[PDB]
Design a protein around this nucleic acid. Structure first.
Length: 150
RNA sequence: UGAAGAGUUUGAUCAUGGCUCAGAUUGAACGCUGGCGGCAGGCCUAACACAUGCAAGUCGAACGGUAACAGGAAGAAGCUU
């Protein structure tokens, strides 16, 4: 019962010698509703073939996000070249008021109380890369309680 | 419970990024309308000018007496006895 979505695309088609060339790309996210989120890229000679190749890569493992219960307990750094980025939990009761530019990557797991819109860049790639590569850097309750105990 | 951007300069992209944002809401105002109360507003643009009505009068119980009327009494009469 995994959930499977696009986010972004290119027009990617230029002049040459010689006439014009074109391509078909995709940036997609997948997840599993108990807490697991992931992401994958692709390309083809054709539209859905690129989406296919992209989602097939997105189906890889999916990071179990530290949720307790409907949303998550630390601002884990999504570190990139300035995105910064962080998200902010809301008090488990009001919705996913996140940036529609990157909301996908948390609605594929049904994370119901997290907000923050597109902080330092007007580009959905900038934040969607920044997040998954910094979500792997999360800590469990039992890990923050070893870090401040044993 | 505090936080969904996005049509262009491209011939395709990531940063620099004036602005329209999907209406903030005034001692705010206007056009073409006429089911409706209510709270509250009374000429910002020439502190320029003008009909007309008037913007503290009560009072004598406060020094010398006193005005039309409501009352009385004389003197004069009207015939109203």
């Amino acid at each position: 019962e995994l959930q499977e979505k696009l986010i972004a695309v290119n027009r990617v088609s230029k002049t040459v010698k010689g006439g014009r060339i074109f391509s078909f790309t995709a940036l997609t996210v997948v997840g599993d509703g108990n807490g697991r989120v992931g992401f994958g890229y692709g390309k083809a000679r054709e539209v859905p073939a690129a989406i296919q190749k992209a989602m097939e890569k997105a189906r890889r493992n999916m990071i179990n996000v530290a949720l307790n219960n409907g949303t998550l307990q630390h601002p884990v750094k999504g570190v990139h070249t300035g995105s910064r980025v962080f998200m902010q939990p809301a008090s488990e009761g009001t919705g996913i008021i996140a940036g529609g530019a990157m909301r996908a990557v948390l609605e594929v797991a049904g994370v119901h109380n997290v907000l923050a819109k597109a902080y330092g860049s007007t580009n959905p790639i900038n934040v969607v890369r920044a997040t998954i590569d910094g979500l792997e850097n999360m800590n469990s309750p039992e890990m923050v309680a070893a870090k401040r105990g044993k």
